[PDB]
Amino acid sequence: EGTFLFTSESVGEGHPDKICDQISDAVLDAHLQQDPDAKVACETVAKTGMILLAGEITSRAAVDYQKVVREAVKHIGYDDSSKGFDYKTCNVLVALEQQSPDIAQGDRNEEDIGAGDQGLMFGYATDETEECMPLTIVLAHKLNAKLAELRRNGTLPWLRPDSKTQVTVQYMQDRGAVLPIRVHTIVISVQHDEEVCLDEMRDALKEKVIKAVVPAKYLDEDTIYHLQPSGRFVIGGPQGDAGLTGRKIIVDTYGGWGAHGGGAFSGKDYTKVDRSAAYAARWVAKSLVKGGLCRRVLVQVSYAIGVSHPLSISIFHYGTSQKSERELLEIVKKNFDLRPGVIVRDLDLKKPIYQRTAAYGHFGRDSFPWEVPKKLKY
Amino acid sequence: AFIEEGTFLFTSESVGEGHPDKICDQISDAVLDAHLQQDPDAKVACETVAKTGMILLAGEITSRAAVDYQKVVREAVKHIGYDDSSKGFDYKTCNVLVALEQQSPEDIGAGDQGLMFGYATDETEECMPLTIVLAHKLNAKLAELRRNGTLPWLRPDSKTQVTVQYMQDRGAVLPIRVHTIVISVQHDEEVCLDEMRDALKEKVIKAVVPAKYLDEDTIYHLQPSGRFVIGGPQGDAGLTGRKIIVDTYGGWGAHGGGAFSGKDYTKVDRSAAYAARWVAKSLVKGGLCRRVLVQVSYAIGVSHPLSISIFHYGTSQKSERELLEIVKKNFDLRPGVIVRDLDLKKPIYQRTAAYGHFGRDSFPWEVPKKLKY
Numbered sequence: 001e002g003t004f005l006f007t008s009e010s011v012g013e014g015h016p017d018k019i020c021d022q023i024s025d026a027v028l029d030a031h032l033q034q035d036p037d038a039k040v041a042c043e044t045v046a047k048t049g050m051i052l053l054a055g056e057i058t059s060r061a062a063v064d065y066q067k068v069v070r071e072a073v074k075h076i077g078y079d080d081s082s083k084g085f086d087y088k089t090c091n092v093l094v095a096l097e098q099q100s101p102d103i104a105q106g107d108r109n110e111e112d113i114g115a116g117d118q119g120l121m122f123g124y125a126t127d128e129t130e131e132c133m134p135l136t137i138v139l140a141h142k143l144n145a146k147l148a149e150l151r152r153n154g155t156l157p158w159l160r161p162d163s164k165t166q167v168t169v170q171y172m173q174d175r176g177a178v179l180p181i182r183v184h185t186i187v188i189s190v191q192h193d194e195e196v197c198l199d200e201m202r203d204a205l206k207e208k209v210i211k212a213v214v215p216a217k218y219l220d221e222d223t224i225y226h227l228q229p230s231g232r233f234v235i236g237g238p239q240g241d242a243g244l245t246g247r248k249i250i251v252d253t254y255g256g257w258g259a260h261g262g263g264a265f266s267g268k269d270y271t272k273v274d275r276s277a278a279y280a281a282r283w284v285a286k287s288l289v290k291g292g293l294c295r296r297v298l299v300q301v302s303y304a305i306g307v308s309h310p311l312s313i314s315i316f317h318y319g320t321s322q323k324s325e326r327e328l329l330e331i332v333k334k335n336f337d338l339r340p341g342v343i344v345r346d347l348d349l350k351k352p353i354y355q356r357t358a359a360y361g362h363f364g365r366d367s368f369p370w371e372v373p374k375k376l377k378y
Numbered sequence: 379a380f381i382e383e384g385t386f387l388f389t390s391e392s393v394g395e396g397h398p399d400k401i402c403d404q405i406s407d408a409v410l411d412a413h414l415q416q417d418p419d420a421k422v423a424c425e426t427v428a429k430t431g432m433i434l435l436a437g438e439i440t441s442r443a444a445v446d447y448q449k450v451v452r453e454a455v456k457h458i459g460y461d462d463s464s465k466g467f468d469y470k471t472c473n474v475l476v477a478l479e480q481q482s483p484e485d486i487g488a489g490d491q492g493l494m495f496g497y498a499t500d501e502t503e504e505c506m507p508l509t510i511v512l513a514h515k516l517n518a519k520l521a522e523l524r525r526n527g528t529l530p531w532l533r534p535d536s537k538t539q540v541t542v543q544y545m546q547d548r549g550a551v552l553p554i555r556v557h558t559i560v561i562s563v564q565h566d567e568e569v570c571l572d573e574m575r576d577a578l579k580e581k582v583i584k585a586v587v588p589a590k591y592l593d594e595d596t597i598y599h600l601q602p603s604g605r606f607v608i609g610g611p612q613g614d615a616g617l618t619g620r621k622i623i624v625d626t627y628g629g630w631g632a633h634g635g636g637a638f639s640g641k642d643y644t645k646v647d648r649s650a651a652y653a654a655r656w657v658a659k660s661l662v663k664g665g666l667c668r669r670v671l672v673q674v675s676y677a678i679g680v681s682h683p684l685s686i687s688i689f690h691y692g693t694s695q696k697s698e699r700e701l702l703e704i705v706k707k708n709f710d711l712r713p714g715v716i717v718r719d720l721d722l723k724k725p726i727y728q729r730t731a732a733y734g735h736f737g738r739d740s741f742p743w744e745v746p747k748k749l750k751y
């Protein structure tokens with residue numbers, strides 16, 4: 001037939017894994033506000049009544065970690081025992097040292113600073129949406145964003161921060177391109193208070209959330225809706241659970257499409273090529289699709305610690321381009337300088353913009369420089 | 379130029395047992411194995427956190443077992459090789475913080491609407507990409523020479539990265555040569571740089587990478603930072619489940635998102651991921667394909683897979699629907715049945731927490747099933 005199903009997941013800000021991501025990037029932004037050259041590698045752990053920060057920081061900034069964390073938890077929305085977590089009374093432990101001096105040494109100009117680590121990173125784009133992202137992860141992200149929006153404007157006051165969404169879309173293949181046909185299944189689980197009744201929640205999730213996010217041409221009579229499938233969900237977040245920074249990296253990127261090199265984003269400054277090179281790889285892929293050179297493209301780059309030039313660069317257009325992959329590679333080499341010291345300059349990665357990225361996806365939102373396509377010259 | 383037009387590069391990485399992320403994976407699965415030995419029906423979701431002098435255990439456990447976490451943690455760190463403050467971490471004196479919430483206590487449906495991927499390629503004997511296989515064995519050779527006194531200046535923390543130059547071959551991929559090798563390993567304060575870099579090329583790389591893949595243009599980045607004395611948890615905080623691509627296919631195939639270590643077999647994204655690899659490897663080893671991606675969809679509540687797609691990249695003489703009918707005649711991919719067929723209630727998981735979950739004969743999902751059709 002040539003038709004397949006694909007599912008992508010997205011979680012809300014209250015998910016324990018995402019709490020750690022946002023806190024880690026909140027610590028990063030705090031240092032960057034005072035020291036644009038701060039070295040930050042801040043991991044976060046969240047369990048019952050605890051937030052723990054562990055990692056390495058080299059900064060001239062004076063940061064109040066107790067208040068940075070508690071304001072992030074407050075922003076996420078956990079302010080009472082009835083929700084399972086409260087920023088006012090939770091335990092905050094800090095185990096932050098200085099960056100390894102062996103790491104810092106391995107003193108040089110801005111344009112050929114070596115990568116802070118080895119690693120491989122992927123970039124991906126697809127013309128199936130105007131965001132150049134897969135429809136499954138775009139819909140999953142926007143659904144969690146609509147839940148938080150309706151929670152914060154008081155129109156659905158029974159909502160709570162923890163949530164998880166899964167969107168299954170039926171796809172058609174066409175010479176390497178993918179055509180979304182219909183939404184097969186939507187799953188939504190969201191934390192809620194004790195007063196609201198189950199049936200009222202499920203109807204509100206369909207009329208006020210799904211219908212407000214999913215275009216009507218993808219929903220039909222056979223679409224399956226799994227709304228609050230586990231029944232009650234009064235307590236969520238870190239209570240009775242455990243979350244870690246960088247445990248939602250597929251949620252953070254392409255929701256299972258493309259490829260992933262394993263590196264996590266949150267809590268890492270721009271010198272960590274896990275973040276800066278992944279943002280640049282998305283920049284390249286989106287510029288190739290928006291520029292009309294392909295319908296769907298995957299990009300890989302890799303680095304070695306202390307070396308500035310990428311060790312390998314590869315392009316794959318899935319057969320959606322008239323031009324061969326090698327000349328796509330040259331168009332990239334002529335338009336992009338993928339050294340980490342040049343990426344930070346081109347993408348303006350010293351700004352405290354990273355707490356915004358820790359939820360609803362790092363890719364597919366016009367607010368970010370790596371999402372603005374580059375006018376290609378060749 | 380003729381070579382440049384019909385050739386691509388691909389890079390994968392791996393890390394050693396002393397890498398702080400892998401320390402946590404190892405300890406989390408050691409906790410899982412400890413509970414499974416006494417209680418084969420134990421439910422485990424154990425996260426480990428590693429920083430300077432600290433191992434922290436957090437998560438939820440429902441088990442009848444009585445596990446000495448001090449002994450399990452400190453013996454895992456001892457096995458890894460951190461036994462003195464001169465190495466940045468010591469199992470005898472490190473702080474072990476236990477924050478686990480322990481509770482005392484087939485048609486099992488899927489707890490998540492998830493996607494599981496299995497992948498296999500005939501480019502190596504273990505049916506795995508050469509990039510991730512070479513990267514894995516390079517770390518293993520380091521630990522082997524460290525533990526038997528051959529290179530006594532070695533230390534447990536290490537990272538490797540391999541870039542292979544490939545040629546396409548009728549939908550299958552064919553390794554031509556090793557383009558670039560990166561090795562960084564922790565070391566003591568006395569051995570010199572030139573001595574380290576020569577032993578890494580002569581006694582590590584050439585003992586692992588076949589000679590036909592190495593030439594005079596192969597690029598070597600050996601100890602590229604120049605000094606790797608500080609390592610392990612002291613030089614970098616480590617968390618469970620931060621090496622899921624190292625754990626799987628090194629960038630090839632696809633990945634759904636879930637980590638493996640610290641979770642018992644009732645977690646579908648671990649047991650079914652193993653079964654997806656089991657299916658793909660059986661298709662290639664059975665001659666049905668040279669290269670295949672098995673894509674299994676699970677509908678919430680439902681036990682049987684909701685949909686299975688087979689991407690053979692045109693390397694199969696049969697069609698996708700034919701391959702699908704062969705899979706369903708030879709595999710029962712329900713989660714509860716997967717556990718029994720793969721004997722997953724055994725304490726076999728600490729061995730998986732390093733050097734890759736896929737590509738080693740000593741695992742039930744790596745024994746290809748002979749297909750009847």
Ligand SMILES: Cc1nc(NCC2CC2)nc2c1COC[C@@]21CCN(Cc2ccccc2F)C1
Pocket residue numbers: 258259298299300314315316325385386387388546551629630631632
């Ligand atoms: C001519 C070509 N070039 C490349 N350039 C390597 C690159 C872009 C990253 N890759 C490929 C081909 C043709 O042959 C098959 C694949 C091999 C890799 N595949 C792409 C892929 C699929 C799934 C997960 C990760 C992947 F990189 C396509």
Ligand SMILES: C[S@@+](CC[C@H](N)C(=O)[O-])C[C@H]1O[C@@H](n2cnc3c(N)ncnc32)[C@H](O)[C@@H]1O
Pocket residue numbers: 040041056099100102103106116117118305397398399535536537562603604605606607608609610613614615
């Ligand atoms: C480079 S560190 C990530 C950044 C680091 N955590 C920081 O504080 O900025 C990632 C891995 O590199 C390895 N590593 C640590 N020190 C190194 C060094 N001096 N040279 C090469 N690799 C090193 C460690 O195994 C560590 O797990």
